[PDB]
């Protein structure tokens, strides 16, 4: 039989979550979410089974000064996993070092905050000195700011960098808690903002989307699976399955 594929992934609602249970769960049964459903669909089309493994360092992936990567991206570069199935953003810097499938979802960076402030945009957020802000450490949102040549965003990066210990958060859970408990706004992808703001009515998006991009399945460069995964994604796209999966996992209007 075909070798069982190793899938690197990361906890991120509603893509990859621990299934609720009255008893201990093991293996792939521990997890549920959009990305688990995506894997069930892709694996049917391609003819494989798979082992879901959370990325040990809990990061999506960014490169340091020497060009050393971490996170799921490093797992692929180092051939520790066959696929990364996650809300993994397709970017120029990543595409140079791994092979992404075509996108299964699109999104853009925006701002998550609490209600009641006059802040209406990134410009407003960067200018004011009352609220802290930042991004998840070593993901694509952080990298967007790090790489930006747009003045407002360059300033925002300098700010995050100067306060990195608190401005750059471990993961989206800590980021959201920071928003709820302190005067902090989180730079976050719009699909996650849509999910959280329909569930916690104390939270809101600020401004519009500041970029536009997609999530793709990651594979190591030269992978014999990337092209088959792309073809499978297009099938699911065209058949309306991706849309159905989004509807299934996004709770729909819970807040005014
Ligand atoms: N999708 C990103 C990771 C991340 C981000 O950098 O914004 C972290 C996590 O943060 C919350 C929300 O944006 C979610 O999609 C996740 O995106 C990536 O591939 O690096």
UniProtKB/Swiss-Prot annotation:
L-glutamate binds at residues 87, 89, 94, 140-141, 189. Residues 118-256 are extracellular. The modification Phosphothreonine is found at residue 197. It is found in: Cell membrane; Postsynaptic cell membrane. The modification Phosphoserine is found at residue 161. It comes from the Eukaryota. Glycans are attached at residues 2, 202. Disulfide bonds join 201-255. The postsynaptic actions of Glu are mediated by a variety of receptors that are named according to their selective agonists. This receptor binds domoate > kainate > L-glutamate = quisqualate > CNQX = DNQX > AMPA > dihydrokainate > NMDA. Ionotropic glutamate receptor that functions as a cation-permeable ligand-gated ion channel, gated by L-glutamate and the glutamatergic agonist kainic acid. L-glutamate acts as an excitatory neurotransmitter at many synapses in the central nervous system. Binding of the excitatory neurotransmitter L-glutamate induces a conformation change, leading to the opening of the cation channel, and thereby converts the chemical signal to an electrical impulse. The receptor then desensitizes rapidly and enters a transient inactive state, characterized by the presence of bound agonist. Homotetramer or heterotetramer of pore-forming glutamate receptor subunits. Tetramers may be formed by the dimerization of dimers. Can form functional heteromeric receptors with GRIK5. Can form functional heteromeric receptors with GRIK4. Interacts with KLHL17. Belongs to the glutamate-gated ion channel (TC 1.A.10.1) family. GRIK1 subfamily. This is Glutamate receptor ionotropic, kainate 1. The gene is GRIK1.
């Amino acid at each position: 039989a075909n070798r069982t594929l190793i899938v690197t992934t990361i906890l991120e609602e509603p893509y990859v979550m621990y299934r609720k249970s009255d008893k201990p769960l093991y293996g792939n049964d521990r997890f549920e979410g959009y990305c688990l459903d995506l894997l069930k669909e892709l694996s049917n089309i391609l003819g494989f089974i798979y082992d879901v493994k959370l990325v040990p360092d809990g990061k999506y992936g960014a490169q340091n000064d020497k060009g050393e990567w971490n996170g799921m991206v490093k797992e692929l570069i180092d051939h520790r996993a066959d696929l990364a199935v996650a809300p993994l953003t397709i970017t120029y810097v990543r595409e140079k070092v791994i092979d992404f499938s075509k996108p299964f979802m699109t999104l853009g960076i925006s701002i998550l905050y609490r209600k009641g402030t006059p802040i209406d945009s990134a410009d407003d957020l960067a200018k004011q000195t009352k609220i802290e802000y930042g991004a998840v450490r070593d993901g694509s949102t952080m990298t967007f700011f790090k790489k930006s040549k747009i003045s407002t965003y360059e300033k925002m990066w300098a700010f995050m960098s100067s306060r990195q210990q608190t401005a750059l958060v471990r993961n989206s859970d800590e980021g959201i808690q920071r928003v709820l408990t302190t005067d902090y706004a989180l730079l976050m992808e719009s699909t996650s903002i849509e999910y959280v703001t329909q569930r916690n009515c104390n939270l809101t998006q600020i401004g519009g989307l500041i970029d536009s991009k997609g999530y793709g399945v990651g594979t190591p460069i030269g992978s014999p699976y990337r092209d088959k995964i792309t073809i499978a994604i297009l099938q699911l796209q065209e058949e309306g399955k991706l849309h159905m999966m989004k509807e299934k996992w996004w709770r729909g209007n819970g807040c005014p």
